[PDB]
Design brief:
The structure is cut from a larger assembly and holds 2 copies of chain A, 2 copies of chain B, 2 copies of chain C and 1 copy of chain D. By secondary structure, chain A is α+β, with helices and mostly antiparallel strands. In chain A, 36% of the residues lie in helices and 9% in strands. The longest helix of chain A has 16 residues, at 27-42. Chain B is α+β, with helices and mostly antiparallel strands. In chain B, strand 6 and strand 7 form a beta hairpin. Chain D has 3 helices and no strands. The longest helix of chain D has 15 residues, at 45-59. By secondary structure, chain D is mainly α. The chains are: A alpha+beta, B alpha+beta, C alpha/beta, D mainly alpha. Chains C and G meet through loops of C and loops of G. Chain C: It is found in: Virion; Host nucleus. Chain C: This is Major capsid protein.
């Protein structure tokens, strides 16, 4: 599940989200999104 | 003094008019029969046995399946490579990421996304939109030339000192097509033309709109994207820029089956275009109803 | 002057206790004349008892029942004042029809179309009234879509009445075929229905109405299971015995709305039972595709309009209690999409409302499902919802809603201009 | 034979109580004349019940 | 269409207002001001863009 | 402040075994299902043609029954009360 | 009109050569939208026998029957297959009427006298008048033949429909 990184030390994010892409990720919104996707999929011989 | 064909054609007129539908039952159009056509003088025969209809319907089944079989082939390749490499996939598209995150939910979202993409398999897709230029006559010579020029040993010094310049093969910007799936609201974007560049800092890919603006997908957890290259390399990427890659495999079809279906058109000259090869062109003629008709 | 009848309409539509069974008889009758003729004795009793018991005008919720009460129930059994109220509602519709066209100038046809149709969309047939029970006479440009393909007439089927019809009752859950009455409603009734639903109703209710479906397939069989309905000839033992004999649901429904000393409980239930013989069909939502009149086509002939309409449905003004188990809420319009009713009827819509309380507005900004939400291809854009939200409940508001329906056709501009409007 | 199918479409399909036999409804016999002719729609018995209910409704009019 | 209606609301996701919807809350005296974001849309009286 | 890992080549995301089991099971289900879309389209066209042809036989059966009934009625009339011609 | 008459003439000149008989068709606002019918550049048709074989080829297969090459110097039979495919499409004549009309009223405004059985007169926003030929393998038509309709616009995009001859000739011919 975890992620293996080449750099052992991370970087602090800087500057706007329109010059480098970044996966920001509060855990609550990801859980809500997964539940919403789950309900959406089944909701739509 | 002679009777004229058009005069008896007009005075005889028509008496037949009926609508017919395409086999898919998607379009209707009218067929008209003139009682002065030589069809009536011919007196030829007609036969509509059941075996012929069954054979025609089988041919139609192949004609329909020509696209969905490529969809299925790419799907099966995705799954086979996903088992092949143990499911653990490297980063291939550049974006910043966190080690402290619930990656399992993104894995399940990836499962949802690939299922939803499989449902919305369609004739318009990045695989078909990348296949279509491959079929054009130029692609054989162009790919032959690209492979030949790539297969060049480093120049001997006199070649670089004298004569016409040395050159670099590929342009800095690549031309790509992609399929975008969003799970939070079931929705799939298939007819996408997109630009891609391989970053100089790290060997990873940066993807751009056809305006120069960056794309937003890698940041959004609820989206997965599929990518195909003009040489038919292939990627399936889930949030974080981690992708599964393989060939686009099409050996599951005979040449005529896909070729007759997806043959890109080439023009034959008609009024309002230059006789010089590929010259610039005026605005289209467009015989139109908003203006008083000319002769 | 009709303002007192309009005040009665305001107080009955906005009342929280609008009588429950009026919704069921609506989907039972469908506005078919024979069904209401069969039910006429029941409804006379229902209005007469209701008006004294509760000072509200019943059956106002649907155009069909109001116009059929005005037309057929005018012989008697009512005090004449109530009949006059129904006549006054129909007269309001007639009056707004009178101004809506351009009577002084609308002589003659243009391109095989009435000249009034170009002036105002209220007189144009492309605009389907949101609640429909009969298909129109004219279907020139209209393409009606039920599943995915526009209905080739082979898809549209008549419904037989009195005859055994088990294949249609099996088809209730199905969607692709359309079962219709053999009465293609006239253009004048078409305009009248549009008036009632588009002009009068959202004006008087301030957008708080809604449309719902009833699960007739499962509702009628357990509602009318008991032997009193099955076995009948060609009594008065005790009220508790009658209550047990008709069932808890029916008692909660009819107990003191349609029962009188001359038709006791089981008699009222039996009299209502006769209507089921038409039964109808489950609710469906239709979308109609139509290019505009040949004047508006000049700019963007591409524009195939999209409009959404509910069939076999009914318009409700309050949330049912006894029918919650058998009903589905359908927001499909920028009117008739009250968040309160929908949130009451279903759990998940209520979750949507509670998570996003700002959506609990009534000005048409409440999210409609993406299927119905083709706003830019619709006829009635946002400004109509806004005005209906603000508009006071007087007859002038109803009339200005029809004045807002004037079209932008060059011929419409010409005609408006010639009248110095 | 016909005993099985008529018992089926009365007690199993229609769920109609045993005291409601063919004698207590002539219209029931006239309807099972039709019902057993098709062996589908037996999973959704509610359709058969609603058809019988509306048929007995129309049979009981005054006019 | 009817049976599917609840499934849309099961998703807890708010939706963006359309440009036409936003344009209806600017009062008359300041529809002409710079703060009217939608003004670049309003090209034609008879037509929506 | 927020902290993140910048992208690279040999950094890798490790799936757990359970998700691999789930994904391969779904792959097997998809392979064995036979729910091909082309078959959905062919099924739809088959329903259309069968519907057309069944409707086509219905009215012809009705016409034949009506002709038989008319001939029988004429037989009864000529047996009971012969008319003119 | 004029295209129907002209092509019925022109096919007679080449009936023996082509073994194709003329078929006259009309298109409306249900086959293609207004701007597409306004800007239409080409119309093409292609025949298919009951066995699923195109007519730009001999019945005894072709070297295109091979599986996809997947090579790069060759793409998929790069030039050969492309030129054979260009061989297997034939070009048809067409005319566009950019105004709304009633088809019977337009035809009677023209020189014809349409003698249809009843007043099923039909209205349309615009009309284009195409005509196609369908092939006689011998002096006979196979009901399971399939005929394809292709439409091309100045941007090079195309639309493609196919019809089986039985629906066109359902009882036009079995009665004849």
């Amino acid at each position: 599940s975890l992620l293996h990184t080449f750099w052992r030390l991370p970087v602090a994010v800087f500057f706007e989200p329109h010059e480098e892409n970044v996966l920001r990720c509060p855990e609550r919104v990801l859980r809500r999104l997964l539940e919403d996707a789950a309900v959406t999929m089944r909701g739509g011989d | 003094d002679e009777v004229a064909r058009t005069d008896e054609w007009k005075g005889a007129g028509v008496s037949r008019l009926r609508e017919v539908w395409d086999v898919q039952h998607r379009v209707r159009l009218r067929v008209l029969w003139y009682v002065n056509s030589f069809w009536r003088s011919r007196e030829l025969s007609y036969d509509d046995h059941e075996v012929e209809l069954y054979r025609a319907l089988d041919a139609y089944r192949a004609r329909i399946a020509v696209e969905y079989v490529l969809i299925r082939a790419v799907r099966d390749e995705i799954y086979a490579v996903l088992r092949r490499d143990g499911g653990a996939l490297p980063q291939r598209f550049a974006c910043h990421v966190s080690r402290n995150m619930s990656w399992r939910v993104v894995w399940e979202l990836c499962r949802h996304a690939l299922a939803l993409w499989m449902d919305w398999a369609d004739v318009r897709s990045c695989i078909i939109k990348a296949l279509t230029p491959r079929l054009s006559r130029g692609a054989a010579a162009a790919a032959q030339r690209a492979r030949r020029q790539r297969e060049r040993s480093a120049p001997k010094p006199q070649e670089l000192l004298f004569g016409p310049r040395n050159e670099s093969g590929p342009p800095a910007e690549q031309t790509w097509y992609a399929d975008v799936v969003r799970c939070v609201r079931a929705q799939v974007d298939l007819g996408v033309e997109v630009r891609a560049a391989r970053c100089p800092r790290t060997g990873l890919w940066i993807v751009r709109d056809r305006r120069g603006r960056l794309r937003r997908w890698l940041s959004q957890p609820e989206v997965c994207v599929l990518y195909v290259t003009p040489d038919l390399d292939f990627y399936w990427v889930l949030p974080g820029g981690f992708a599964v890659s393989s060939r686009v495999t099409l050996h599951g079809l005979a040449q005529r089956a896909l070729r007759d279906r997806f043959q890109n058109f080439e023009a034959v000259l008609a009024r309002g275009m230059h006789v010089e090869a590929g010259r610039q062109e005026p605005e289209t003629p467009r015989v139109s109803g908003r203006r008083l008709p000319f002769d | 002057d009709y303002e007192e009848t309009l005040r009665l309409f305001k107080t009955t539509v906005t009342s929280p206790n609008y009588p429950e069974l009026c919704y069921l008889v609506d989907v039972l009758v469908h506005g078919n004349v024979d069904a209401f003729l069969l039910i006429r004795t029941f409804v006379a009793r229902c209005i007469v008892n209701m008006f004294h018991t509760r000072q509200l005008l019943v059956f106002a919720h649907s155009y069909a029942l109001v116009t059929l009460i005005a037309e057929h129930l005018a012989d008697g059994a009512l005090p004449p004042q109530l009949l006059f109220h129904y006549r006054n509602l129909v007269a309001v519709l007639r009056l707004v029809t009178r101004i809506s066209a351009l009577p002084g100038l609308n002589n003659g046809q243009l391109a095989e179309e009435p000249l009034s149709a170009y002036v105002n969309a209220l007189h144009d047939h492309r605009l389907w009234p949101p609640f429909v029970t009969h298909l129109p006479r004219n279907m020139e440009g209209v393409q009606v879509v039920a599943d995915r393909q526009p209905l080739n007439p082979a898809n549209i089927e008549a419904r037989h009445h009195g005859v055994s019809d088990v294949p249609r009752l099996g088809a209730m859950d199905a969607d692709e075929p359309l079962f219709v009455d053999d009465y293609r409603a006239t253009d004048d009734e078409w305009t009248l229905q549009k008036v009632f639903y588009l002009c009068l109703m959202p004006a008087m209710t301030n957008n708080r109405a809604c449309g719902l479906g009833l699960n007739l397939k499962t509702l009628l069989v357990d509602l009318f299971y008991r032997p009193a309905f099955l076995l009948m000839p060609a009594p008065e033992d005790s009220i508790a015995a009658q209550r047990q004999a008709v069932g808890e649901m029916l008692t909660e429904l009819v107990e003191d709305v349609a029962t009188d000393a001359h038709t006791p409980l089981l008699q009222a239930c039996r009299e209502l039972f006769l209507a089921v013989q038409f039964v109808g069909e489950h609710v469906k939502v239709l979308e109609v595709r139509a290019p505009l009149d040949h004047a508006q086509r000049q700019g963007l002939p591409d524009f195939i309009s999209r409009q959404h309409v509910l069939y076999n449905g009914c318009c409700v003004v309050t949330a049912p209690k006894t029918l919650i188990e058998y009903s589905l809420p359908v927001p499909f319009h920028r009117f008739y999409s009250n968040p309160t009713i929908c949130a009451a009827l279903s759990d998940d819509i209520k979750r949507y409302v509670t998570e996003f309380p700002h959506y609990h507005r009534h000005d048409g900004g409440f999210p409609l499902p993406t299927a119905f939400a083709h706003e830019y291809h619709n006829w009635l854009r946002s400004p109509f919802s806004r005005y209906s939200a603000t508009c006071p409940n007087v007859l002038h508001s109803v009339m200005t809603l029809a004045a807002m329906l004037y079209k932008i056709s060059p011929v419409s501009l010409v005609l408006q201009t010639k009248a110095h409007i | 034979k016909r005993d099985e199918k008529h018992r089926h479409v009365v007690n199993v399909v229609l769920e109609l109580p045993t005291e409601i036999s063919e004698a207590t409804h002539p219209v029931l016999a006239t309807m099972l004349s039709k019902y057993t002719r098709m062996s589908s729609l037996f999973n959704d018995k509610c359709a058969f019940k609603l058809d019988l209910l509306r048929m007995v409704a129309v049979s009981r009019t005054r006019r | 269409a009817a049976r599917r209606i609840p499934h849309f609301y099961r998703v807890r996701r708010e939706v963006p207002r359309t440009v036409n919807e936003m344009k209806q809350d600017f009062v008359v005296t300041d529809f002409y001001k710079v703060g009217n974001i939608t003004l670049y849309t309003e090209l034609h009286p008879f037509f929506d863009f | 402040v927020a902290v993140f890992f910048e992208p690279h080549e040999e950094n890798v995301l490790r799936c757990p075994e359970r998700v691999l089991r789930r994904l391969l099971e779904d792959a097997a289900v998809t392979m064995r299902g036979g729910g091909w879309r082309e078959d959905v389209l062919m099924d739809r066209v088959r329903k259309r043609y069968l519907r057309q042809e069944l409707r086509d036989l219905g009215h012809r059966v009705q016409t034949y029954c009506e002709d038989l009934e008319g001939r029988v009625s004429e037989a009864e009339a000529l047996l009971n009360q012969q008319c003119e011609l | 009109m004029e295209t129907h008459l002209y092509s019925d003439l022109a096919f007679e000149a080449r009936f023996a050569d082509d073994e194709q008989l003329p078929l006259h068709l009309v298109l409306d606002q249900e086959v293609l939208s207004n701007e597409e019918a306004e800007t239409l550049r080409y119309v093409y048709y292609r025949n298919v026998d009951s066995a699923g074989r195109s007519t730009g080829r001999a019945p005894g297969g072709d070297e295109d029957d091979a599986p996809a090459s997947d090579d790069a110097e060759d793409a998929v039979g790069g030039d050969r297959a492309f030129d054979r495919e260009r061989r297997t499409w034939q070009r048809a004549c067409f005319r566009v009427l950019p105004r709304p009309l009633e088809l019977l009223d337009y035809l009677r405004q023209s020189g014809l006298t349409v003698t249809l059985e009843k007043e099923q007169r039909v209205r349309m926003f615009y009309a284009v008048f195409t005509t196609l030929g369908l092939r006689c393998p011998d002096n006979r038509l196979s009901g399971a033949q399939t005929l394809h309709l292709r439409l091309v616009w100045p941007d090079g995009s195309y639309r493609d429909w196919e019809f089986l001859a039985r629906d066109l000739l359902r009882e036009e011919m079995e009665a004849n």
